[PDB]
Amino acid sequence: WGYGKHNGPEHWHKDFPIAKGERQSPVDIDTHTAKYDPSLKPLSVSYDQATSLRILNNGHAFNVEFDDSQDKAVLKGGPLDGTYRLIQFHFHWGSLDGQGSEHTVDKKKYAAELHLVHWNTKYGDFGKAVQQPDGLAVLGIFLKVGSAKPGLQKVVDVLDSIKTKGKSADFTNFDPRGLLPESLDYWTYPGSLTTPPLLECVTWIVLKEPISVSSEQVLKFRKLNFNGEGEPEELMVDNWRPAQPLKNRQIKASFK
Ligand SMILES: [Zn+2]
């Protein structure tokens, strides 16, 4: 599977029939039909002890991976019951600044989208959690092009070392707090992973406030490659799945 004409999102259902399922992601967030939910408890992003380990080009994005063997960087509160441990983050981005995000807001596409992926500690490990309807919580953050995001520059500067599929690099002491906007106002709905295997195990929490990154920062993402070393160059761009049918779901807002 990939993002091209012959293996991209419109083809995924042949190997992954859940692609046409009842709770697929991403979706368009219609801000005029999402409803404020006063039963939502406050969202807690506790990243002070986060322990990054490595950055990896997996041929569809790059993942910054974290030590998840203890409660050190966790998401709680909001729509969540229990404690979800950060395992990795990655991004989806476009070839042009007018596309790249997976979720859309009143059909608006952002230049990119950050996914911080967490798993429910009640299930013991990530591989078991993805088999559960409440296994994962993914915090989604939109990126727009404007001012540089200083807390992103350490990621930008390492990309030269992981240009091609399969390459990895040490990436310790990276603080993911530097990627968060001021406001934690969010929308939430039940959905799926947005890459194969497309499992329907995600509580999505999508922040309303985008972060700004500079044109130079996003241009460096666009220099990555989908191919491995020694293969014909295919720029890693447009690695986003479009919006899927909402079906029988409601999107709730944390804010009035
Ligand atoms: Zn993602």
UniProtKB/Swiss-Prot annotation:
pH dependence: Optimum pH is 6-8.
Signal peptide: none
Positions of substrate binding: 194-195
Phosphoserine PTM sites in chain numbering: 161, 168
Annotated PROSITE patterns: ALPHA_CA_1, ALPHA_CA_2
Annotated phenotype, changing residue 193 to A: Reduced CO(2) hydrase activity
Mutation effect (residue 63 to L): Reduced activity
Gene3D superfamilies registered for this protein in UniProt: Alpha carbonic anhydrase
Outcome following mutation: residue 58 to D: Strongly reduced activity
Site (Fine-tunes the proton-transfer properties of H-64): residue numbering on this chain: 3, 58, 63
Compartment list: Cytoplasm; Cell membrane
Outcome reported for the amino acid change (mutating residue 113 to Q): Strongly reduced activity and sulfonamide affinity
GO biological process, any: regulation of monoatomic anion transport
Outcome reported for the amino acid change (mutating residue 58 to L): Reduced activity
InterPro entries noted in UniProt: CA_dom (IPR001148), CA_dom_sf (IPR036398), Carbonic_anhydrase_a-class (IPR023561), Carbonic_anhydrase_a-class_CS (IPR018338)
Effect the entry attributes to changing residue 115 to D/N/Q: Reduced activity
Effect of residue 195 to H: Higher affinity for bicarbonate. Enhanced proton transfer capacity
Catalytic-site annotation from UniProt: 60 (proton donor/acceptor)
Effect upon mutating residue 197 to A: Normal CO(2) hydrase activity, but impaired stability
Enzyme class per UniProt: lyase
Keyword Zinc assigned: yes
Keyword Membrane: yes
Disease affiliated with this protein: Osteopetrosis, autosomal recessive 3: A rare genetic disease characterized by abnormally dense bone, due to defective resorption of immature bone. Osteopetrosis occurs in two forms: a severe autosomal recessive form occurring in utero, infancy, or childhood, and a benign autosomal dominant form occurring in adolescence or adulthood. Recessive osteopetrosis commonly manifests in early infancy with macrocephaly, feeding difficulties, evolving blindness and deafness, bone marrow failure, severe anemia, and hepatosplenomegaly.
PANTHER family: CARBONIC ANHYDRASE, CARBONIC ANHYDRASE 2
Stated name of the protein: Carbonic anhydrase 2
Organism name: Homo sapiens (Human)
Phylogenetic classification of the source organism: Eukaryota, Metazoa, Chordata, Craniata, Vertebrata
Gene: CA2
